[PDB]
């Protein structure tokens, strides 16, 4: 650990000033008023995960009931209902092309669903096994490549046609709750109950960097739109922004009013607005530069598990344990 | 301004809503149980009439009432994250090692862990002390005294009366952790059972109607 202490001095030597000082002289975000333009119903139990499609017109929502449903946002119409072998789920992912959806649960398997088939049903093309514990996040790099996060302290990349791990990321000392994919897809990050977020190169199979600034477990992680920074969500009731090139925490988002844990995070396309979902049943929008809470979006009676901003940037969809998922614009 | 395609989509969408409603209504008839035992528990042993690495399920029906029991082999010792899913369960059965004494302090700490969790407050606990006949044989031999393991148990006032007093003492030890919260929404029910009991499903069944009875009293403003 002597090199780590030298590393601790090395990071301090690299950074001249904190982000907060530089951020001070910019025009304020101002009061933003976002009212829910839609509410989506038909989920009869707690919703753990949602993912926005690339089109921004489709999303998939996983729930305690054991029915994974795909619905259309604007009309609010419902496109599919997928029966699940396991009732217990924590993850859902939407493929970039949109043909594939993945489901992961306490069964320790990530089930990948091809939406298009003869007979017009959703079928599982592959069930992926090799994780000793639950999968906490899944994300598609590509139509044939998926990276999974799990409570084994391991993250795994699979070839769906081959059906076994082509690479294993096993640098973590704790259960890895969340995983975020970069815009370039060649690097990704993952966060865990060890309270450390690590930068993973997809091709190498190695951890390039490790960043820790969190008191508690990180439940959620999101990459900045540029792809050079990311934000994390923790039970510490704090959201911290780290930068890849600088390798240091730029800023932390915290307030006295909120002691409850973060459960989700996402960025607007600007990156000015880091949307966050809390255990207090309220979702707060923060000026990213100044760490000042612009406004609060409070339409949920129970905790918000998942929050996502569309790829086009129009809307924020919040799914909660209240059992219906509300779009916000 | 709504096309035949949008209306025909609305057809299969509303059928999806109806099918989800029917599936949910089918699910609500079932009552869900989560069985946690640290070790030496007899989790398989509790119900033998009826009997996937991550989660292992045993399901039994009594009086045409269906019970779903979930036990996890895959998960590690620490259970913080996966417990959050099972906050809709009817009850959580904690089976504990009656026989050995050295386990009992850690077992009580585990009881406090399951009881005091923020997400699992509303749920109650149904407690079976397995292998109590094996405990009675050892205590009748009298070589090892559980009163030595705890100074309060060293002086205690309540099958032989002494073995019965020790058995009631450990039972009260498990109840002692549960009473402290005092909210009253959640109450633990101690029960005693040897290794081979013809039906502990009867005890699970009467405890379940008691819990549902109390929740209904709370719902109807009777209490």
């Amino acid at each position, epitope marked *: 650990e002597q090199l780590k202490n030298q590393i601790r001095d090395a990071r301090k030597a690299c950074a001249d000033a904190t982000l907060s000082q530089i951020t001070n002289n910019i025009d304020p975000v101002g009061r933003i008023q976002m009212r829910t333009r839609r509410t989506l119903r038909g989920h009869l139990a707690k919703i753990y995960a949602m993912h926005w499609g690339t089109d921004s017109r489709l999303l998939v929502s996983a729930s305690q009931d054991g029915k994974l449903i795909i619905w259309d946002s604007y*009309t609010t119409n419902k496109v599919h209902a997928i029966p699940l072998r396991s009732s217990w789920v924590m993850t859902c992912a939407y493929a970039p092309s949109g043909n594939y959806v993945a489901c992961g649960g306490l069964d320790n398997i990530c089930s990948i669903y091809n939406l*298009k088939t003869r007979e*017009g049903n959703v079928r599982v093309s592959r069930e992926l096994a090799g994780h000793t514990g639950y999968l906490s996040c899944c994300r598609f790099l590509d139509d044939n490549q998926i990276v999974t996060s799990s409570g084994d302290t391991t993250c795994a990349l699979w070839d769906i046609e081959t059906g076994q791990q082509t690479t294993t990321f096993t640098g973590h000392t704790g259960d890895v709750m969340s995983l975020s994919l970069a815009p370039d897809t060649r690097l990704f990050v993952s966060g865990a109950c060890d309270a450390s977020a690590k930068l993973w190169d997809v091709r190498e199979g190695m951890c390039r960097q490790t960043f820790t600034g969190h008191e508690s477990d990180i439940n959620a992680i999101c990459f900045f739109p540029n792809g050079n920074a990311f934000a994390t969500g923790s039970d510490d009731a704090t959201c911290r922004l780290f930068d890849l090139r600088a390798d240091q925490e730029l800023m932390t988002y915290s307030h006295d009013n909120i002691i409850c844990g973060i459960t989700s995070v996402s960025f607007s396309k600007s990156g000015r607005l880091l949307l966050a979902g809390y255990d207090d049943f309220n979702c707060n929008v923060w000026d990213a530069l100044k760490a000042d809470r612009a406004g609060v979006l409070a339409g949920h009676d129970n905790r918000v598990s998942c929050l996502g901003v569309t790829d086009d940037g129009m809307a924020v969809a919040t799914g909660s344990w209240d059992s219906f998922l509300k779009i916000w614009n | *301004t709504v*096309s035949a*395609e949008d209306k*025909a989509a609305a*057809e*299969r969408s509303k059928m999806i809503d109806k099918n989800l409603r029917e599936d949910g209504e089918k699910a609500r008839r079932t009552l869900r149980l989560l069985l946690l035992g640290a070790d030496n528990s007899g989790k398989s042993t509790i119900v033998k009439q009826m009997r996937t690495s991550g989660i292992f399920e045993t399901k039994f029906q009594v009086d045409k009432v269906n019970f779903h029991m979930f036990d996890v082999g895959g998960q590690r010792d620490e259970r913080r994250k996966w417990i959050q899913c099972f906050n809709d369960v009817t009850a959580i059965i904690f089976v504990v090692d009656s026989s050995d004494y050295n386990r009992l302090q850690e077992a009580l700490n585990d009881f406090k862990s399951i009881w005091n969790n923020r997400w699992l407050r509303t749920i109650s606990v149904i407690l079976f002390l397995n292998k109590q006949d094996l405990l009675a044989e050892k205590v009748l031999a009298g070589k090892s005294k559980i009163e030595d393991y705890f100074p309060e148990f060293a002086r205690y006032t309540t099958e032989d009366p002494r073995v019965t007093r020790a058995k009631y003492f450990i039972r009260k030890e498990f109840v002692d952790i549960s009473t402290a919260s005092g909210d009253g929404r959640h109450i633990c029910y101690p029960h005693f059972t040897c290794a081979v009991d013809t039906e502990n499903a009867r005890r699970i069944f009467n405890d379940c109607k008691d819990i549902i009875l109390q929740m209904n009293l709370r719902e109807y403003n009777l209490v």
Partner: single-chain antibody
Amino acid sequence: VQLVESLSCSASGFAFSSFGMHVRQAPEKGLEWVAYISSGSGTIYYADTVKGRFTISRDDPKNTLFLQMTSLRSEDTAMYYCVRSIYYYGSSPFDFWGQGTTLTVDIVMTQATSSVPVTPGESVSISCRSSKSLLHSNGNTYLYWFLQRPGQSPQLLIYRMSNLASGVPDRFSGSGSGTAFTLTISRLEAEDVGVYYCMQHLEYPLTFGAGTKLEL
């Protein structure tokens, strides 16, 4: 996924209750509409000509689309094949057709040239205008095309003039302006030959055209 007929139309190779089901080919001319039933008997629609003298029935164990006939007339006689669909965002309607049988006893869509001479390797266009503006308040254009090879029931090729059905060679393509539309074919080959029919699905009846033909 095979549809057999005896009208009775027995379906083997898919989940029967998940699909909608629906066509009459005149011996003299092209396709013209009969009737539509949704999945699990949601709704029924008819054109006035064949209306009131036919019935649709579904039975899940028998897995069959049914036609019971009244008022039999020289219009009734026809060759019909069972047609089906699935509707959601990402719709691929009119995907697969039945084998066919023979029995012996609103918007107008047509394309100008009934017969088109074909030269290999040269791009050509088949245009059929629509009476009612295909473009809809969402922005989804409901213009469709088919190909019936002789002796084989037709298949889907292009829907909406911006989307192309899978299972189709990519050479066929589309371009469109509001309520006036022009199709693009390229690199025509053997098995391209046949009669192409186009359709409009803003509101029933299913206005099917007599179509145009590729002639070698």
